[PDB]
Every structure is written in structure tokens, then in C-alpha cells.
Design a protein around this ligand. Structure first.
Ligand SMILES: CCCCCCCCCCCCCCCCCC(=O)O[C@H](COC(=O)CCCCCCCCCCCCCCC)COP(=O)(O)OCC[N+](C)(C)C
Ligand SMILES: CCCCCCCCCCCCCCCCCC(=O)O[C@H](COC(=O)CCCCCCCCCCCCCCC)COP(=O)(O)OCC[N+](C)(C)C
Ligand SMILES: CCCCCCCCCCCCCCCCCC(=O)O[C@H](COC(=O)CCCCCCCCCCCCCCC)COP(=O)(O)OCC[N+](C)(C)C
Ligand SMILES: CCCCCCCCCCCCCCCCCC(=O)O[C@H](COC(=O)CCCCCCCCCCCCCCC)COP(=O)(O)OCC[N+](C)(C)C
Ligand SMILES: CCCCCCCCCCCCCCCCCC(=O)O[C@H](COC(=O)CCCCCCCCCCCCCCC)COP(=O)(O)OCC[N+](C)(C)C
Ligand SMILES: CCCCCCCCCCCCCCCCCC(=O)O[C@H](COC(=O)CCCCCCCCCCCCCCC)COP(=O)(O)OCC[N+](C)(C)C
Ligand SMILES: CCCCCCCCCCCCCCCCCC(=O)O[C@H](COC(=O)CCCCCCCCCCCCCCC)COP(=O)(O)OCC[N+](C)(C)C
Ligand SMILES: CC(C)CCC[C@@H](C)[C@H]1CC[C@H]2[C@@H]3CC=C4C[C@@H](O)CC[C@]4(C)[C@H]3CC[C@]12C
Ligand SMILES: CC(C)CCC[C@@H](C)[C@H]1CC[C@H]2[C@@H]3CC=C4C[C@@H](O)CC[C@]4(C)[C@H]3CC[C@]12C
Ligand SMILES: [K+]
Ligand SMILES: [K+]
Lengths: 267, 337
């Protein structure tokens, strides 16, 4: 605890994104000097879209585990400290987190096979969630320490709920589909923004981390809703430079996007 | 070194100005008045003051003019977006400089109530003020700072209310449907155009993909001008591995290349049976066949036809050959038959 090992978690996530990106380019370069893909890509297409009987099982199961994974983060965020040292067997939360991540890793591989374009699949917004969530876990299980990191990014998976419902033919009316999309976007952004504020405020300013503003995750949720509604009580506010820096950008695009969202939700 | 260039540039604009009196009162001219003459005071007075040098941020609103001079911006939306972005950023930075100067210097004639406040904290302060959030952690204490804040609240809030909503709107949503169909070895695909709605697509897909039919792998490509509604997008999602959609018109040769009509097995032109004017619907669909045949004559075309007397126009097309597979489905002829 004398020296923070947060860069080790960040370095692996950056390396995984960089290594995965160049391999696709390297494979294209390797394809210049150089079936299963005909069957697997078509087969994986129905698996992710829930067209086959086994495809719907995967679609429903990943829907449930996405909800359960976010709950695991909620109890994790309840910890007062940002970095903890503990063995894998000591805590059962880490074991269950590992159980959910291996499923999210094989599911990531399945979509990669079903992806028609490999370069854009790596650069899609969904893959960045996996890059900053899965590789951190193996680093934690290897170095034998845990860190809050960027674990709040699984809240971004809540915006695929309308896609899952449409795959199972649950939503049919256009109004119902539009309402579900807007609700998922508002909730996912609200929870993700709270996680960013919670991490930045608690960790403190980089490279010295002497100004740590103790702030509970649920208090951050109450802080964001006040900020979004332009109420600004001032009882809870950001003090760190990075906390204020992110708030400046959130006030620009977060309110602008939500300007046309709530009016078309109430009607 | 920068100011002597900004001084000769001021002289160049003075020569090019048709009217001299109105050139002296220009907003960009006042920026030169409070920037360069103070600079030559420092070289002589041997002391530096923050002063009003923050006015160089007002030069950011000349950025759209510079881009238009170089013919970089041509579209109206691109020009409008640059103008709104430059106006908002320059006002935001200039207002922060005014707050930073007034708060740090203190009230005139005593200068004993100075409030130590960083420039970047002022930048964070104005954006909170313009968003009408008002945390209250950072606020103005001097008389001048509050006086300028009162003036800013009247005009600065209007700038935020007009620029920010349009900036995101001008950027807009990405074109979800577009690009070129991916080429696959041994792939048999067809192109369906014409009346593409949730009514036509759902009935067509149920018939085309039926368990009682022969098991053949044929991808279906839909081309339409309007973006599909949420009902149609969900239908395409359930048929992701076999049904594909593109945005574009069949009469555009560029759009024909995107869907690869020349490699398509056949082209299907649906028709709007419940149309107000069958003559208009028939002839619009006839023009679609001409565009497809113009791109390549050796393409099988199947079209739905409302009235029979419009079949003569298609039969008179030099590239129309019934022996090669071209067929006309006449609704009136079959229904009355
Ligand atoms: C923190 C954890 C948060 C987890 C949940 C995050 C939010 C996910 C979104 C949940 C609410 C989405 C809105 C649901 C919605 O709007 O649908 C509503 C009705 O609800 C549904 O039809 C969806 C079935 C419920 C699925 C269970 C959702 C659980 C999450 C549309 O209103 P309607 O009755 O007029 O339309 C009926 C027509 N059909 C039947 C064809 C649809
Ligand atoms: C992303 C953030 C990466 C920041 C890397 C630069 C760090 C350089 C450095 O030396 O750290 C700090 C510099 O800290 C900073 O300036 C943070 C600025 C980052 C603002 C984020 C910009 C993002 C643009 C989009 C030096 O110390 P100090 O001058 O701030 O005063 C002492 C403060 N304590 C005691 C906390 C150290
Ligand atoms: C639809 C979306 C619904 C979202 C509901 C979110 C409700 C957020 C309530 C936040 C209240 C809060 O900030 O108090 C916080 C909340 O503390 C908690 O125990 C939160 C438990 C309930 C969380 C809300 C779950 C509702 C479902 C107090 O924290 P503290 O003790 O550290 O305060 C300093 C002493
Ligand atoms: C603090 C310091 C701040 C410095 C920068 C201050 C802001 C200056 C403005 C920078 C952003 C301007 C907006 C650019 C813009 O809106 O154009 C964007 C595209 O960007 C451009 O075309 C401009 C070329 C980049 C010029 C480099 C800007 C560097 C500053 C609109 O997207 P589009 O593809 O749909 O436009 C197609 C139209 N044609 C064919 C003409 C290109
Ligand atoms: C343009 C701004 C021009 C301001 C000139 C007014 C100066 C009058 C003056 O004597 O200064 C001050 C008064 O300063 C002011 O009230 C500034 C008011 C300017 C309002 C701007 C009007 C612009 C119209 C558009 C006298 O001292 P005091 O009453 O504030 O109390 C003393 C406290 N200390 C010691 C901290 C100052
Ligand atoms: C497009 C326009 C983008 C503009 C982004 C501006 C972001 C400003 C964030 C406010 C930062 C802030 O308030 O903290 C400031 C931090 O000041 C800084 O060091 C700024 C470093 C980063 C500058 C922003 C670069 C953005 C690109 C508080 O300063 P202080 O330490 O002196 O406070 C007293 C203790
Ligand atoms: C900035 C440009 C944003 C463009 C978004 C455009 C948009 O509105 O779509 C928005 C889409 O908004 C989203 O999907 C938000 C995606 C989540 C983005 C957050 C993911 C990244 C989190 C931050 C990662 C970095 C973390 C840094 C700290 C470590 C919703 O509106 P709509 O298209 O559904 O409705 C259309 C009707 N109109 C057009 C009127 C709004
Ligand atoms: C795909 C890449 C290029 C996007 C940019 C990389 C981003 C995700 C990386 C690079 C620098 C990283 C930051 C470096 C420093 C800090 C401060 C620490 O207290 C919390 C984590 C945080 C805030 C990191 C978050 C993730 C981060 C912003
Ligand atoms: C073209 C002319 C008539 C316009 C009005 C002249 C303006 C620009 C001049 C005249 C008086 C000047 C002010 C005199 C006193 C102060 C207080 C000092 O602490 C900050 C500068 C400030 C605020 C000056 C700003 C510039 C100023 C307001
Ligand atoms: K308001
Ligand atoms: K307020």
C-alpha cells in the first residue's frame, strides 16, 4: 500500500487493446503472403442474435449475467478503500467476478467470429468495455491485489438491453422500442458517470494522491442527478482537478443530449 | 515576435479597408488596441501586468473566416458548426479572463480584497455558471467581479442556450446504414428495391424464407431512400445472418455499386399496390428498371406492375429480354384473369 500499483492494471488494458489491434493488422499483412470461417461465422451469427434454440439461451443468459455483474460492482464500490490486498480464496466476491468474466470473454470471442469486419469490431464502443474490464481481472488474480480501477464500465452494458429484448421479440411496438432505448441510455450514462466521479474523487490527483475526497458511490449518484437537473445544491461538489475536469465535459454533452431525451420520454 | 507580425497585419487590413472610420471601430481592431500598445510599454516600463491581454481569445472567432478563405469548409452545416463552435469557445475563454483579472486584482483604489483564484478554476467557474448549475464552491467576491457576472448572466446564458443545442444537433447521429456490401466467395445474393416498408418486407421475408421451400442460401439486400423505422430495424436484427439493408436510391450509379447489382442473382422491384395514382407508381418503377439495365444489361429484373398498358414501355426496352429471365408481374392482368 506504500506504492500504488494502479498503472499495472492500466498498462495491461492498454496493451490488450494495442496488441489486439495490431494482430488484426498483422493478420491482414499475414493474409497477403497466405471452410471453418464459412460455417463458424454464419453459426455465430444466430448465436448472438438468438435465432436458434441454443442462441436464445445465450441471449437470455448474457442478459441476466449483465444485470448480476453490475450488482457485484455495487457491493465492490461500498469499500471505503480504493486499493486492497487480499488473496483469491479470502473473498468470494472476486471468485464470482472471475466466474462472470470468463463467460464475458468467450462471448467476446463468439462475436469476433460473427463480426464481418475485424478492424471495426476492435474499435467499436462495446469492445472497449471488455478491454478495460477483463484483462484487469487476470492482473488482479496474478499480482494478488485488487483495485477499483475502471470497473464501472460494465454499466455501459445496460444499453444493449433493448437489443436483447428485440432479439427475443419482446418489444414489437415502435413506441415501446423507443421508450426502452431512451430509458436504457439515461440509466447507463447516469450510473457510468457516477462511477467516473467516484473513482476520480476518491483516488485524488495523479502522481501524488494527497487530496482524497471521501465520497460514497451512492452519494455520487445523488450528486449526478442534482447536477443533471441543474439544481446545484452545493452540499456535495468535486474538489480534485480531474473531478472538475470531467464535470466540465459532462456539463457540455451530458445536458445537451438529455435536453431532447426527457421531453420525448414523458409523452 | 508575435505582436510585430500582428501589427503589420493590422496595417495591411487598414490599406485593404474601403472605409477607414468604420475599420477603426471594428471589434477585431479593438483587440489590437489593447494588446500591442501595452506590449511596448513593458519593454520600456520594465514591468509586466496581466492587463487585458486575454482579448487575444477573441481572435478565435476569425477561425471560420480563415477556413472559408482556404476553401476548407464548403457545406452549410460544416460552416455553421465551425461558426457556433468558435463563438462559444472564444466567449468562454474571454469571459474567464475577465473574471480572472477582476478577482485577482481586487477592487480599484484600495486593492486590498484580492481573491486568489486560478485561471483554469475560472474556466470551470464560467461553465458551471453558463449551465445554471451554481455549485457555490467558487464564486465572485469583488464588486467588479459580481458586476461583470450580472452583465454576463444576461447575455452569456443566451449564448449557451443557442450554441450548445445546435452544436450537437449539427454533428447529428452517425449514418447507421451505408458503405459497400462485403464480397464473399461463392455468395448468391439478390437486391430488393421499390416499396420497402414493414408491410412489404415482413410478407416477403416469410415467403422467401420458408421451411417448405428448397434449402438454398441466398442473401437478401434491401435498398431504400428513407431510413427504416424502429419496427423495420428490429425485423432486420432478427434476420441479421440472412437479410441486409442499405440506404440509397436505385437510380444512383454510386448506390448501385455499393450493393453490387452486377454480381446479384436478380433484382426485385416491389410496387405500392395501395397507391393514389397507379400511373405515377408504374412509371416510377419503370424508371428503376432503366437505371438497373443502364448499369448492366445482363441482370435479371422482376418488377410488379399495376396496369397492363405500362408493360409496352418495358417490352420496348432494347436491353429487356424475357428469355434471359426478365419477368413482369402485372397486378391487373393476374387479378382480373
Ligand atoms: C440498476 C439496474 C437497472 C436494470 C434495468 C435497466 C433498465 C432496462 C430497461 C427496463 C425498462 C425498459 C422499458 C420497458 C418498456 O418500455 O416496455 C413497455 C412494457 O414493457 C414490456 O413490454 C417489456 C417486458 C418487460 C421485460 C422485463 C424488463 C426487466 C428489466 C411498453 O409499454 P406498452 O405496454 O404500452 O407496450 C406493449 C407492447 N409490447 C408488448 C409489444 C411491448
Ligand atoms: C490525464 C491526467 C494525466 C496527468 C499527467 C501530468 C502529471 C504531471 C505532474 O507532475 O502532476 C501534477 C500536475 O497535475 C495536473 O496539472 C493535472 C492536469 C490534468 C488535467 C486533465 C487534462 C485532460 C485534457 C482532456 C504536478 O503537481 P501540481 O502542479 O498540480 O501541484 C501539486 C499537486 N499535487 C500535490 C497533487 C501533486
Ligand atoms: C430508476 C433509478 C433509481 C436510482 C435510485 C438511486 C438512489 C440514490 C440515493 C442516494 C442517497 C445518498 O446519497 O445517501 C447515501 C446512500 O447510502 C446508502 O446506504 C445507499 C443504499 C441505497 C442505495 C439506493 C438503492 C435504491 C434501489 C449515504 O451514504 P453515506 O453514509 O456515505 O453518507 C455520508 C454519511
Ligand atoms: C483552446 C484552443 C482551441 C483551438 C481550436 C478552436 C476551435 C476551432 C474550430 C475547430 C473545429 C471546427 C469544426 C470543424 C467542422 O465542423 O467540420 C467537420 C469536419 O472537419 C473539417 O472538415 C475541417 C478540417 C479540419 C481542420 C483542422 C481544425 C483544427 C482546429 C464537419 O464534418 P463533415 O465531414 O460532415 O464536413 C464535410 C464538409 N466538407 C466537405 C467541407 C469538409
Ligand atoms: C467600468 C467600471 C468602472 C468602475 C469605476 C467606479 C469606481 C468608483 C470607486 O470609487 O470604487 C468603488 C466602487 O466600485 C464600483 O462600484 C464599480 C461599479 C461599476 C459598475 C459598472 C457600470 C458599467 C455600465 C455598463 C468605491 O468603493 P466601494 O463603494 O466599493 O467600497 C470600498 C470597498 N473597497 C475598498 C474594496 C473598494
Ligand atoms: C474545448 C474547450 C475545452 C476546455 C477544457 C477546460 C478544462 C478546465 C478544467 C478546470 C480545471 C480546474 O479547475 O482545476 C485547476 C487546475 O489547474 C490546472 O493545472 C489546469 C491543467 C489542465 C488545463 C486544462 C487543459 C484542457 C485541454 C485548479 O487550479 P489550482 O491548483 O491553482 O487551484 C487552487 C488549489
Ligand atoms: C459528442 C457527440 C454525441 C452525439 C450523440 C447524438 C445523440 O443524440 O445520440 C445519443 C446517444 O448517446 C449515447 O449513446 C451515449 C453513449 C455513452 C458514451 C459514454 C461511453 C464512454 C464513457 C467515458 C469513457 C472515458 C472515461 C474517462 C474517465 C476515466 C442519444 O440520442 P438519440 O440518438 O437516441 O435520439 C435522437 C434524437 N436527437 C437527435 C434529437 C437527439
Ligand atoms: C484507448 C485509449 C487511447 C483512450 C485513452 C486512454 C485512457 C482510457 C487511459 C489513459 C490514461 C488513464 C488515466 C491515467 C490516470 C488516472 C488517474 C487515476 O487516479 C484514475 C485512473 C486514471 C483516470 C486513468 C483512467 C484511464 C486513462 C484515462
Ligand atoms: C473606447 C473606450 C471609450 C471604451 C471604454 C474604455 C475602457 C475599455 C477602459 C477605460 C477605463 C478602463 C478600466 C479602468 C480601471 C480598471 C480597474 C483595473 O483593476 C482593471 C482594469 C480596469 C477595469 C480598466 C479596464 C478598461 C477600461 C474600462
Ligand atoms: K433550467
Ligand atoms: K444552484
Amino acid at each position: 500500500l506504500k506504492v500504488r500499483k494502479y498503472w499495472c492494471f492500466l498498462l495491461s488494458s492498454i496493451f490488450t487493446f494495442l496488441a489486439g489491434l495490431l494482430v488484426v493488422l498483422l493478420w491482414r499483412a499475414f493474409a497477403f503472403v497466405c471452410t471453418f470461417m464459412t460455417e463458424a461465422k454464419d453459426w455465430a451469427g444466430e448465436l448472438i442474435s438468438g435465432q436458434t434454440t441454443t442462441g436464445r439461451i445465450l441471449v437470455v443468459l448474457v442478459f441476466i449475467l449483465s444485470i448480476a455483474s453490475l450488482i457485484i460492482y455495487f457491493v465492490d464500490a461500498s469499500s471505503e478503500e480504493v486499493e486492497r490486498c487480499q488473496k483469491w480464496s479470502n473473498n468470494i466476491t472476486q471468485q464470482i467476478d472471475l466466474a462472470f468474466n470468463i463467460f464475458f470473454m468467450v462471448y467476446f470471442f463468439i462475436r469476433f467470429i460473427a463480426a464481418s469486419d475485424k478492424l471495426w469490431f476492435m474499435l467499436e464502443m462495446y469492445s472497449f468495455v471488455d478491454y478495460f474490464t477483463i484483462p484487469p481481472s487476470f492482473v488482479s488474480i496474478y499480482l494478488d491485489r485488487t483495485w477499483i480501477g475502471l470497473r464501472f464500465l460494465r454499466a455501459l452494458r445496460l444499453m444493449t438491453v433493448p437489443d436483447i429484448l428485440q432479439y427475443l421479440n419482446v418489444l414489437k411496438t415502435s413506441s415501446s422500442i423507443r421508450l426502452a432505448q431512451l430509458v436504457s441510455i439515461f440509466i447507463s450514462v447516469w450510473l457510468t458517470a457516477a462511477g467516473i466521479i467516484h473513482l476520480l474523487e476518491n483516488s485524488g490527483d495523479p502522481l501524488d494522491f494527497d487530496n482524497a475526497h471521501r465520497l460514497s458511490y451512492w452519494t455520487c449518484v445523488y450528486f449526478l442527478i442534482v447536477t443533471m437537473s441543474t439544481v446545484g445544491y452545493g452540499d456535495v461538489y468535486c474538489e480534485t482537478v480531474l473531478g472538475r475536469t470531467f464535470l466540465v465535459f459532462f456539463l457540455l454533452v451530458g445536458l445537451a443530449i438529455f435536453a431532447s431525451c426527457i421531453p420525448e420520454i414523458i409523452d | 515576435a508575435f505582436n510585430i507580425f500582428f501589427m503589420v497585419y493590422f496595417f495591411i487590413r487598414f490599406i485593404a479597408a474601403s472605409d477607414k472610420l468604420w475599420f477603426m471601430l471594428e471589434m477585431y481592431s479593438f483587440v489590437d488596441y489593447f494588446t500591442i500598445p501595452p506590449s511596448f510599454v513593458s519593454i520600456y516600463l520594465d514591468r509586466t501586468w496581466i492587463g487585458l491581454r486575454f482579448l487575444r481569445a477573441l481572435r478565435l472567432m476569425t477561425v471560420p473566416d480563415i477556413l472559408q478563405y482556404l476553401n476548407v469548409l464548403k457545406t452549410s452545416s460544416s460552416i455553421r458548426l465551425a461558426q457556433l463552435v468558435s463563438i462559444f469557445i472564444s466567449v468562454w475563454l474571454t469571459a474567464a479572463g475577465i473574471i480572472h483579472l477582476l478577482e485577482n486584482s481586487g477592487d480599484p483604489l484600495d486593492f486590498d480584497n484580492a481573491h486568489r483564484l486560478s485561471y483554469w478554476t475560472c474556466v470551470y467557474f464560467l461553465i458551471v455558471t453558463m449551465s445554471t448549475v451554481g455549485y457555490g464552491d467558487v464564486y465572485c467576491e469583488t464588486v467588479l467581479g459580481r458586476t461583470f457576472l450580472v452583465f454576463f448572466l444576461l447575455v452569456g446564458l443566451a449564448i449557451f442556450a443557442s450554441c450548445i443545442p445546435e452544436i450537437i444537433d449539427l454533428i447529428g447521429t452517425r449514418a447507421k446504414y451505408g458503405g459497400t456490401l462485403k464480397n464473399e466467395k461463392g455468395r448468391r445474393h439478390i437486391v430488393v428495391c421499390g416499396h420497402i416498408t414493414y408491410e412489404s418486407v415482413s410478407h416477403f421475408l416469410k415467403d422467401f424464407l420458408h421451411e417448405d421451400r428448397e434449402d438454398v442460401d441466398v442473401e437478401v439486400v434491401f435498398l431504400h431512400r428513407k431510413p427504416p423505422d424502429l419496427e423495420l430495424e428490429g425485423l432486420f436484427k432478427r434476420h441479421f445472418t440472412t437479410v441486409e439493408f442499405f440506404q440509397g436510391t436505385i437510380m444512383n450509379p454510386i448506390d448501385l455499386q455499393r450493393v453490387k447489382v452486377h454480381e446479384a442473382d436478380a433484382c426485385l422491384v416491389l410496387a405500392n399496390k395501395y397507391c393514389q395514382d397507379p400511373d405515377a407508381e408504374d412509371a416510377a418503377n419503370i424508371m428503376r428498371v432503366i437505371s438497373i439495365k443502364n448499369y448492366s444489361d445482363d441482370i435479371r429484373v422482376i418488377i410488379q406492375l399495376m396496369q397492363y398498358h405500362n408493360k409496352a414501355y418495358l417490352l420496348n426496352i432494347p436491353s429487356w429480354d424475357w428469355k434471359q429471365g426478365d419477368d413482369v408481374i402485372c397486378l391487373a392482368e393476374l387479378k382480373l384473369g
